[PDB]
């Protein structure tokens, strides 16, 4: 029943020995790291899942053109009513920098409908402290705000309104549903979050990856970094979130991926959907959609020793055994090493531990002379 | 920025900037190579990233 | 040079015609699997010479 395909994999080409102009892959690949086409042949439905980082003007224009020309039967935008009101009252803005100028005003859309009781006040204090710590660990600049919707969402909603097609607002990253989910989990604590976030990069790999990721963010801007965020980088970011806060990652990524899949699969008009969601929900939504509609790419079975050339090893062993027998017969002696090629791991060059291979259990053992030149004929024939 | 642009064409401000620029480029220092290898040895020390992209390093078996 | 060339020809002739018992073994234990040799990587550029 359960299709256990890989969802969040960031390790690209671990079988290549890459480096020095032989890269493991291209991460720029614009217009393809963002748009995914999914199909539901059972109902004949088509979904255009657009994963936006809310930071690039080029991707916003591409999304606007896609909504204009595709003419979907429904548009699913991951915003809310407050943000939509604020953004629709903003006009004559056509570049992402101008909209970044309104980042605080659009961030006012993060409204929490919580009570003023003692428990809710304590929760608000804990949640705000945890948000401050997790933003310290996230460390994104002003021009790269993946969780504050920008021009892509606004263009999608406006083009949906022009065509008079219904618009379904899925809420921001932290909405009432996710706020209640975080309320259920009592694992929010700023100090424990600091301690666990300074222990997330437990080996050098993560550290190095971390560095270069943010290094690029410091060199190229938000617009140039949004284009160069592929599936592998997105999966690395979701896994970094999981290492920082596994419980809040489960609440914010996995559960919201399932909720968005529910909304896109059942709570929608259908037969053509354009869904502009955040970048890091695309893997989960796509995996769920493919599993439910059985539209997974065909399985190519991977034999663990499929890339192992056992014939090479056996041929080398046979060749070196024949060469040892031949040279020993020529020189009227026996082999000195029984190791095909000399390497310093056994220290047999200067210590007393030989690599001689002569094993038998009695005087009648047929395999007594295996490995010795006596095993071969004068024609260097393997037997007798 | 508007004020700074407004006082860009003034001769006194330009004179101060000119003095600043002149003092900036006044002290240009030369750092020689004092090892016996000199220029060619240093140049050969800076060839690591480009050795593998050369014809003599192409896999070319005699037999 | 001449004698070494003759000896090398002799040795190569010995190695070409020698019996290879590993070709009669179990695939995946003493032989390549029945499918063959596979590459599971996804290269993005030509490997250097």
């Amino acid at each position: 029943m359960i299709s256990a395909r890989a969802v969040h994999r960031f390790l690209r080409n671990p079988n290549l020995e890459t480096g020095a102009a032989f890269r493991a892959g291209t991460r720029f690949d614009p217009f393809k790291n963002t748009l995914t086409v999914l199909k539901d042949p059972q109902n004949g439905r088509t979904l255009y899942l657009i994963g936006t980082t809310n930071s690039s003007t080029l991707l916003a224009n591409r999304t606007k053109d896609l909504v204009q020309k595709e003419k979907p039967d429904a548009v699913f935008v991951q915003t809310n009513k407050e943000w939509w009101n604020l953004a629709k009252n903003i006009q004559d803005v056509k570049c992402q920098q101008e909209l970044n100028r309104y980042n605080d005003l659009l961030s006012q859309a993060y409204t929490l409908s919580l009570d003023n009781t003692i428990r809710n006040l304590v929760f608000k204090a804990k949640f705000y402290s945890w948000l401050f710590v997790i933003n310290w660990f996230k460390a994104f600049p002003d021009d790269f705000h993946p969780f504050i919707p920008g021009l892509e969402m606004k263009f999608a909603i406006e083009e949906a309104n022009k065509q008079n097609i219904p618009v379904v607002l899925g809420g921001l990253e932290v909405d009432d549903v996710t706020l209640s989910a975080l309320k259920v989990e009592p694992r929010l604590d700023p100090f424990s979050q600091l301690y666990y976030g300074y222990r997330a990069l437990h080996n050098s790999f993560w550290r190095r990856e971390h560095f270069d990721n943010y290094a690029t963010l410091d060199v190229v801007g938000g617009e140039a970094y949004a284009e160069s965020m592929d599936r592998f980088r997105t999966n690395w970011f979701v896994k970094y979130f999981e290492k920082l806060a596994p419980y809040q990652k489960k609440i914010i990524v996995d559960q919201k991926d399932l909720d968005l899949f529910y909304a896109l699969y059942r709570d929608t008009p259908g037969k053509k959907i354009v869904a502009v969601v955040n970048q890091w929900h695309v893997p989960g939504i796509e995996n769920h959609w493919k599993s439910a509609t059985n539209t997974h790419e065909p399985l190519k079975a991977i034999n663990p020793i499929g890339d192992m050339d056992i014939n090479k090893y056996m041929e080398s062993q046979l060749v070196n055994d024949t060469l040892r027998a031949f040279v020993s017969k020529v020189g009227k002696t026996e082999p000195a090493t029984w190791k095909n090629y000399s390497t310093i791991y056994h220290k047999d060059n200067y210590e007393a531990e030989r690599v001689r291979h002569v094993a038998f259990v009695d005087h009648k053992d047929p395999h007594m002379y295996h490995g010795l030149p006596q095993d071969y004929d004068d024609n260097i024939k393997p037997k007798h | 920025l508007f004020l700074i642009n407004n006082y860009k064409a003034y001769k006194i401000n330009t004179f101060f900037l000119y003095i600043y620029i002149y003092l900036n480029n006044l002290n240009i220092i030369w750092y020689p190579i004092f090892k016996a290898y000199s220029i060619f040895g240093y140049y050969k020390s800076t060839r690591l990233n480009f050795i593998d992209t050369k014809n003599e390093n192409i896999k070319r078996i005699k037999y | 040079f001449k004698r070494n060339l003759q000896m090398q020809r002799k040795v190569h002739d010995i190695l070409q015609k020698m019996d290879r018992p590993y070709l009669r073994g179990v695939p995946g234990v003493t032989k390549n699997i029945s499918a063959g040799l596979q590459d599971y990587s996804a290269p993005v550029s030509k490997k250097s010479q």
């Binding site: 014939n311 041929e315 | 005699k62 037999y63 | 040079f1 060339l5 090398q8 020809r9 190569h12 190695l15 070409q16 290879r20 070709l23």
Partner: peptide
């Protein structure tokens, strides 16, 4: 296999030095 035999036999070819 005959193809593998051909390849491995081609591995040991003395050049006309």
């Amino acid at each position: 296999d005959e193809a593998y035999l051909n390849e491995v036999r081609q591995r040991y070819v003395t050049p006309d030095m």
